[PDB]
Design a protein around this ligand. Structure first.
Ligand SMILES: [Zn+2]
Lengths: 71, 247, 50, 53, 84
RNA sequence: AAACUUUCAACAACGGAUCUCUUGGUUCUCGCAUCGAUGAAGAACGCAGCGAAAUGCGAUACGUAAUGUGAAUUGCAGAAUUCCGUGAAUCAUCGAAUCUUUGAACGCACAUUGCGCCCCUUGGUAUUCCAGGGGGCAUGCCUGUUUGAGCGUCAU
RNA sequence: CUAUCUAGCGAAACCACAGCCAAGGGAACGGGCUUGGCAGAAUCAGCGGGGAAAGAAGACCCUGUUGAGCUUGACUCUAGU
RNA sequence: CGUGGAGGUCAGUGACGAAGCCUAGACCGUAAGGUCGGGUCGAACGGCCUCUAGUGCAGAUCUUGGUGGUAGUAGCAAAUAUUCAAAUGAGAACUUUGAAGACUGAAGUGGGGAAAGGUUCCACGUCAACAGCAGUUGGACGUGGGUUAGUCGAUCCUAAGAGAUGGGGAAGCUCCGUUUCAAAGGCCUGAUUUUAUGCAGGCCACCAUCGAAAGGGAAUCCGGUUAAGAUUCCGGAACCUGGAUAUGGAUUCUUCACGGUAACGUAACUGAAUGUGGAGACGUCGGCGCGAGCCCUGGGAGGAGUUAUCUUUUCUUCUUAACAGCUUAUCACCCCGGAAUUGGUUUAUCCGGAGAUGGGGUCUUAUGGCUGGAAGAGGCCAGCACCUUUGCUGGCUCCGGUGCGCUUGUGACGGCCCGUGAAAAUCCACAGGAAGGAAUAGUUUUCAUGCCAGGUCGUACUGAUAACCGCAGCAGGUCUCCAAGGUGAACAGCCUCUAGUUGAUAGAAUAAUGUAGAUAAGGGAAGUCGGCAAAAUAGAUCCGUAACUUCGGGAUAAGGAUUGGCUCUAAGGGUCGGGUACGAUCAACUUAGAACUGGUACGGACAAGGGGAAUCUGACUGUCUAAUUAAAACAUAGCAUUGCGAUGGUCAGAAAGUGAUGUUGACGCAAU
RNA sequence: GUCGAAUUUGGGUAUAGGGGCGAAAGACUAAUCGAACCAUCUAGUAGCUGGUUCCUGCCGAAGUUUCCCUCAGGAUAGCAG
RNA sequence: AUAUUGGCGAGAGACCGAUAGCGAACAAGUACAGUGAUGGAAAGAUGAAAAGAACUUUGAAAAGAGAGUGAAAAAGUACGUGAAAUUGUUGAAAGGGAAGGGCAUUUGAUCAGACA
């Protein structure tokens, strides 16, 4: 998932099971004060949900990951 | 013993009739104020072949008298009709092959078909391919007409009962032998599940009252009584005569 | 199957999390009668009927 | 790396190896038990056809 | 063959997971379960299966509410604030 | 003569008997009456700094609030006066709450995490469209209310 | 290609104790008893005489005051009509 | 006599060792059994008088647990087959790489999927167990990582069918029934200054709902990318649906477009109720036409192979997606015209005064062509650099031919039937003429452009001589798609290319008996219940064919001959100055014939009928005892009989305002 | 053996125990079918078969009479303690 | 006043003592089998305290031999005592197609006490 943060503007999160791609696009707007191009979603085989949200071309993914604190 | 295979038929469940490909219930149109006083005109749009019937159908269309609409009925088409012919329906209608007339209005000696027993059951008497009824006299007192039937039996019915005029199309269907079990199979593929009929004497004592024995015979007299019960009624049911008639 | 329903994917994800040995710090408690994970399934031996 | 998760919470790197080798044997005696006891009434069928005469 | 060559044709399930007792008994063609009849109101239970009520009666589960009723009776179904 | 075979003893092996234990059963007596539409019994999936199960619990998730006790928990890590204290704890009590998806199961459906509808609100040019939130929408029956039906029927 | 010999791996049926014969008597066809013939460790590959070899409380027959399938004008009833 | 417990007593024994257990050590008793020494061992236990019982084992094809002999034995033998070096390693027949040798051979041992499994996928560690030998490897053990959707599926609609409500049965769990004997609704604007709403003026009277990851169905393609994911990611290029919605164009001062004889045409070009019509929407077989992909193939531009000789050689790359524009046809249709001396015409015989042939047009756009997409991608080469991230620069990516080829899509037709071979959702169109509207205005959002949004769940991998079921890593079983070259009639068999595998315990020896495969002097069924088993014949071409017959057959009847190789000759087509005798010309594989030739061999391996004469029996094709019976039995068409005109025949239900035949009607149903 | 059809087959759905289904074998109905499987009444009943656990002492039989749907069994008399 | 083999809380026993007592003293209606209804086990004890064997050396490693803890590893997580079948080493003896047993003694081994 670090390859998706560094190459593309793709932030990867583990989201709660009841979220539906509008509650994730709006969460990253409200939590991180950014804009989101597009959210993708899969349900991991350990039964949790993983969301490939994607920042849009002027927000950078490395700066948001460093302000969060997982580098 | 088991229940025998003429007892297994009343439950249906494989023995019901195969009704995917049939057009609909072939019935005369209902008795209304147009059809008791005067006639009503309709046109044969097409002549179709329904599956599991030896006679073609006719899809006449009658305009709705009370609404602005078309109402399509299905008649059992009789010989000589064609698409685009006009079918006139009622008391004051003409007398040609295809019109439907109450049996008082037709003269004695005519032949009609698809007659109704009661005056409003929408036609259920002579319907198979080639069978008519022959009017053999009216009765202006008591309002009755007497007809004979395809079985040779004479029956007196109401005089307001309708019936289309002419012998039912399909004609001499049974003059041709099927020649193959593969042609009788497809005939019963669209009728119901009763075709390969195992003889009763081939069976065991459980399966049939005929069955069993170190030879193949019936054992007791094959003419069964009338007040016999469900499961004994195998063989001729109440045979007055039996055997070939003359020789 | 591949095209599977959610209430069997919810069941095979629980079986993934239960496909774990005993944690090794369990064997060090005071009255610890447990010695291995006896309800441990493997796809070769025992099919789960879900 | 979840290998340090062991090293802070009880278990050592050496204690895991001698612990699992006991543990992988504690399941060995039990499966040797299951094969031995069941082997009497496991050939005991119900509806055998006897293909002879 | 009716044995080994006919056990190979078994790849279509006839029961699936029940929704009210959660075990593979919900028969798909009948659309009714068979350990407890699920589209029915009352659960399926018979006194000839005395053992099969031990596995399913009151007490084999969490008892999320019923385990406190015996304590609440002793104090007398009281309410309100507690104490000092 | 050896080997081998058989017997016995010693020590070793296999194997788990015997003996001595026992937070478990069993039966007997005594006392009480306490499930659920205010959502039960049962189910499914979850939750711990390190848990797979058991026990506990429900997105407030090995618990919270309250009262009591008065210094632990402990496998490890961590946390220290929190120790003459509105205060430790996997403590007891328990009256305040939460209680996911379900289930008599209740918007319709359910082999579907399928599809609606009404209402207050928020956002996107927005009564109509999409979306996030909050609250509703089962059936039988009783009592009352309101609005109707019926040349059933009575005066006008 | 096996069998055979080697390295590795390694079961089962069966088994009172067991295992050389002749005649005798005997539950009337003995591996054991009685009288004789005799008889030398350990064994390997074959073999199908024997072990009334193994397989399964005889599937035939009889007995049971034991059943079941089936039949009919057996006895006693019964849905239906 | 012995045992488990109970009351009493010996102020019994005991950590200085109770109970237990062992002991070819001792003693007592006829015996059941009692006592003692030694060894072991570690927490309780006895004597005697009485009480009480779940109280004494060699057996029960006893029960549970444990262990033997057999026995280092039977065996680990189908699926063609393995070998050399090196690396890692304590250790190599078995792991990895390289070099050989081979096999599956395009109905694969290949590439994918539906069920079903469920983390087996993938990486890093690691070999106690499992992989019936081995192990350093593993579908194993240990820790982790991994499945991304507006277009792909579900969801949506209906099928055979399940099923609530109303009701009606039922002591009752519940049963019948699915529009039913029901008061079972929503919706257009007039209402639009209250928009509460009233008359509206009608309304689908069908009236739950579930039922298909193979039916119906709004819309996505190419290139890259990962240890493991792609129609999902990244990059480019599109389309659809639901919205709002402003420009441009259109139309309008006769308000709701013009052109063509016409079939019809276009960038647009108001249209409510209600009604009708189409699409969704359908069988199978046969040949024929066309298309796409593959195959074969010529020239040129590259790269590798062979080279003693020969070979302008053998192999290989030379590719274009959805979508959008312009165009392109059989069929059908319109106009002009008027046909016997009958013409037109298909492989297949149909069409014409109900208007052919002919001349001129119109349309559908399956499909093909050009162009955009798009060469910038991809492919093949050459060159020069290097950190690992990575490149960087030049070229080239071309023009054709061919056909009873193969697969497959489709078009126009033909054959068949007592068989005419699903339904809804959804979508559009017409008839209708309600309503509304122009001069800065409306209609336009079916014309072009522009703006926003497209949720939920599945997505890895296997799909089987190791991921499913068969107790297992079992020669069994399990639905489906694509499919190269040669031989040849062929998807036969045999050999090879792409791709995959080289896994199945091995080593030595070559006794008997086996199992699988072979061959035989002379005789040729003498064998045996019996020609069981094996052999013989077989392809093709030409010749020749009987009794019998339901005239179709019998029939590949029987029986006879030829077949290689090589050099040739003749016939059968297409395009062109000469068909209103002929000429160069490109391009098929087909048949017939003749010489010459050889150890008289030639369907040279593979593949591939034994035939005849009669009887018994069932007419045939078909079906059955899964796992001892495939038959003469069952079925069949044919024939005949009986029942019944619906207030009914045969059958069902505990019952019913219940059902099968019946969406039926004697040419039918039912029973034989 | 058959190989274009009374063909083969996937998925859906229908019929369930004295019932289903049957081109008929008493065949098939989850290795079960001349009546499935599971639980219960149930420790069904048996005049029939097998087994029946310590020692010593003393006494010590019967296979016969009569009746019995009686003849592999009982009652009764006998013998015995 | 009566019934109560379920629920909740108590008290008790001439009861059973891990093949017993409930199916379950233990992660027991658990693992596992069956499509399904249903079927359904086995499995308790180191020591007072883990003081669960630091270190040395042989081995590739498991392990071994020492050492060390302990009252005791003749208690080392295969853990109280640890019977028999069956098995190994050592010691004794016997043995021509079985072995075993009864009476009697020789020989070897072994045991013995009133007078000792
Ligand atoms: Zn259930």
């Amino acid at each position: 998932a670090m390859k998706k943060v560094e190459d593309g503007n793709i932030l990867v999160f583990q989201v709660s099971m009841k979220a539906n791609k509008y509650q994730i696009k709006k969460a990253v707007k409200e939590l991180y004060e950014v804009d989101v191009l597009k959210v993708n979603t899969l349900v991991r085989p350990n039964g949790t949900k993983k969301a490939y949200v994607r920042l849009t071309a002027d927000y950078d993914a490395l700066d948001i990951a460093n302000r969060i604190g997982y580098i | 013993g088991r229940v025998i295979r003429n007892q297994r038929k009343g439950a249906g469940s494989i023995f019901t009739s195969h009704t995917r490909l049939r057009q609909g219930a072939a019935k005369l149109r209902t008795l209304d104020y147009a059809e008791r006083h005067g006639y009503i005109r309709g046109i044969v749009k097409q002549i179709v072949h329904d599956s599991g019937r030896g006679a073609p159908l006719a899809k006449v269309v009658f305009r709705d008298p009370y609404k602005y609409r078309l109402r399509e009925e299905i008649f059992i088409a009789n010989e000589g009709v064609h698409t685009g012919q006009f079918i006139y329906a009622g008391k004051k209608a003409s007398l040609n092959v295809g019109n439907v007339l109450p049996l008082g209005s037709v003269p004695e000696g005519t032949i009609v078909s698809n007659v109704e027993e009661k005056p409003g059951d929408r036609g259920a008497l002579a319907r198979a391919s080639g069978n008519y009824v022959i009017i053999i006299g009216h009765n202006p007192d008591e309002n009755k007409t007497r007809v004979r039937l395809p079985s040779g039996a004479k029956k007196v019915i109401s005089s307001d009962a309708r019936g289309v005029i002419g012998v039912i199309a399909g004609g001499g269907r049974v003059d041709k032998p099927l020649l193959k079990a593969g042609r009788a199979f497809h005939k019963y593929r669209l009728k119901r599940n009763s075709w390969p009929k195992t003889r009763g004497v081939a069976m065991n004592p459980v399966d049939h009252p005929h069955g069993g024995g170190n030879h193949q015979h019936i054992g007791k007299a094959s003419t069964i009584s009338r007040g016999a019960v469900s499961g004994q009624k195998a063989g001729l049911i109440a045979a007055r005569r039996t055997g070939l008639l003359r020789g | 199957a591949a095209q599977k329903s959610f209430r069997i994917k919810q069941k095979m994800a629980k079986a993934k999390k239960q496909n774990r040995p005993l944690p090794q710090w369990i064997r060090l408690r005071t009255n610890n009668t447990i010695r291995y994970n006896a309800k441990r399934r493997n796809w070769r031996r025992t099919k789960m009927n879900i | 790396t979840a290998a340090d998760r062991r090293m802070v919470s009880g278990v050592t790197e050496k204690q895991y190896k001698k612990g699992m080798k006991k543990m992988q044997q504690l399941e060995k005696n039990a499966i040797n038990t299951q094969i031995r006891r069941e082997i009497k009434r496991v050939n005991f069928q119900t509806h055998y056809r006897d293909e002879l005469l | 063959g009716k044995g080994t060559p006919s056990f190979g044709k078994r790849h279509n399930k006839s029961h699936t997971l029940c929704n009210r007792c959660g075990r593979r008994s919900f028969h798909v063609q009948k659309k009714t379960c068979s350990s407890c009849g699920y589209p029915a109101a009352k659960t399926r239970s018979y006194n000839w299966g005395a053992k099969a009520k031990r596995r399913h009666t009151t007490g084999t589960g969490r008892m999320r509410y019923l385990k406190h009723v015996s304590r609440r009776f002793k104090n007398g179904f009281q309410t309100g604030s507690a104490s000092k």
